[PDB]
C-alpha cells in the first residue's frame, strides 16, 4: 500500500535566477518523503502514474518549465502567465508516467516574478495516481 503525496510552498525571500530549480522549502505534506525541500525536486521511488501541480503568486511576468528526467533533466512543458503592474496567481499541471529514479521539478526562466509569502503563496504538489 503506497501512499505518496507532497505539497510544499516557497517561503525563502530570494529572487529566482534563469534556469534555477525553484525550491519550495516549506512542506505542508510529504507522505513517503519522496519530495526534498532542500532542492524542490520530487524523486520517484515507486514507478507509476503521478499528477503534478502548482499555483504561483506573482507580481509580474512569470514563466516556469516543468522538468522530468534522471541524471539529465528535460522539459515537458512551459507555463507562462503575464501581469502588467498588478498581482496574479497562476497555475499549471501535468499527469506524468514515472520510472524509478526519475525526478520532477519546476525550473525558473527569464520571467521570474514569483512571490513566496504569508498571504500570497506559491505551492508545488504531487501525488501518485496508480502504481506501475
Amino acid at each position: 500500500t503506497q501512499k505518496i503525496a507532497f505539497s510544499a510552498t516557497r517561503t525563502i525571500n530570494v529572487p529566482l535566477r534563469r534556469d534555477q530549480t525553484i525550491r519550495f522549502d516549506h512542506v505542508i505534506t510529504n507522505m513517503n518523503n519522496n519530495y526534498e525541500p532542500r532542492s524542490g525536486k520530487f524523486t520517484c521511488k515507486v514507478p507509476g502514474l503521478y499528477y503534478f501541480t502548482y499555483h504561483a503568486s506573482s507580481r509580474g511576468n512569470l514563466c516556469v518549465n516543468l522538468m522530468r528526467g534522471r541524471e539529465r533533466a528535460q522539459k515537458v512543458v512551459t507555463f507562462c502567465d503575464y501581469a502588467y503592474n498588478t498581482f496574479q496567481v497562476t497555475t499549471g499541471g501535468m499527469v506524468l508516467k514515472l520510472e524509478q529514479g526519475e525526478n520532477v521539478f519546476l525550473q525558473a526562466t527569464d520571467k521570474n516574478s514569483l512571490l513566496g509569502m504569508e498571504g500570497a503563496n506559491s505551492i508545488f504538489s504531487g501525488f501518485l495516481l496508480f502504481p506501475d
Binding site: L49, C63, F79, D81, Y84, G92, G93, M94, F130
Partner: protein, 133 residues
C-alpha cells in the same frame, strides 16, 4: 486495476469548431483521450477529475462539457477577459461521475475563443480516475 489518466497539450492542433483539441499527448494511460478529436472517452465507470490550464492573450471563455448516450451536457464556464495582448492562463476543473461511453472535452465560446498558438508556452488538458463505481 484501471489506471485511466491523461494529459495532452497544444502544438499543431487542427482548427475549426468550438471543441478545443489538445493534439499532443504527454500521457494517456489506457488511451482514454483521442488526440484527433479532443475528447476523452470513459471506459471505467466512476468519479474522474478533469482540469485545464489554457493560454490566451485576449479573450477566452472555456467550459468542460460531457456527453452521455450522445446527449450533450453543458456545464461550468471559466474565462479570462483581460484583453491586453499578454499571456493569461484561464483555468478550471471539476469532478465528473461518468458512465461507460460518456465523453468529456473542452469547448470554447465562439465569441471569446482566443487560444495562443506557438512555441513560447503551453495549454494543457488533464484527467484521471479518482475511483471506480
Amino acid at each position: 486495476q484501471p489506471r485511466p489518466a491523461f494529459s495532452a497539450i497544444r502544438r499543431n492542433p487542427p482548427m475549426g469548431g468550438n471543441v478545443v483539441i489538445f493534439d499532443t499527448v504527454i500521457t494517456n494511460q489506457e488511451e482514454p483521450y483521442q488526440n484527433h478529436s479532443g475528447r476523452f472517452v470513459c471506459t471505467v465507470p466512476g468519479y474522474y477529475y478533469f482540469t485545464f490550464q489554457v493560454l490566451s492573450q485576449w479573450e477566452i471563455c472555456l467550459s468542460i462539457v460531457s456527453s452521455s448516450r450522445g446527449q450533450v451536457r453543458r456545464s461550468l464556464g471559466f474565462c479570462d477577459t483581460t484583453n491586453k495582448g499578454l499571456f493569461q492562463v484561464v483555468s478550471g476543473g471539476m469532478v465528473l461521475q461518468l458512465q461507460q461511453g460518456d465523453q468529456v472535452w473542452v469547448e470554447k465560446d465562439p465569441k471569446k475563443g482566443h487560444i495562443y498558438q506557438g512555441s513560447e508556452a503551453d495549454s494543457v488538458f488533464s484527467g484521471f480516475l479518482i475511483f471506480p463505481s
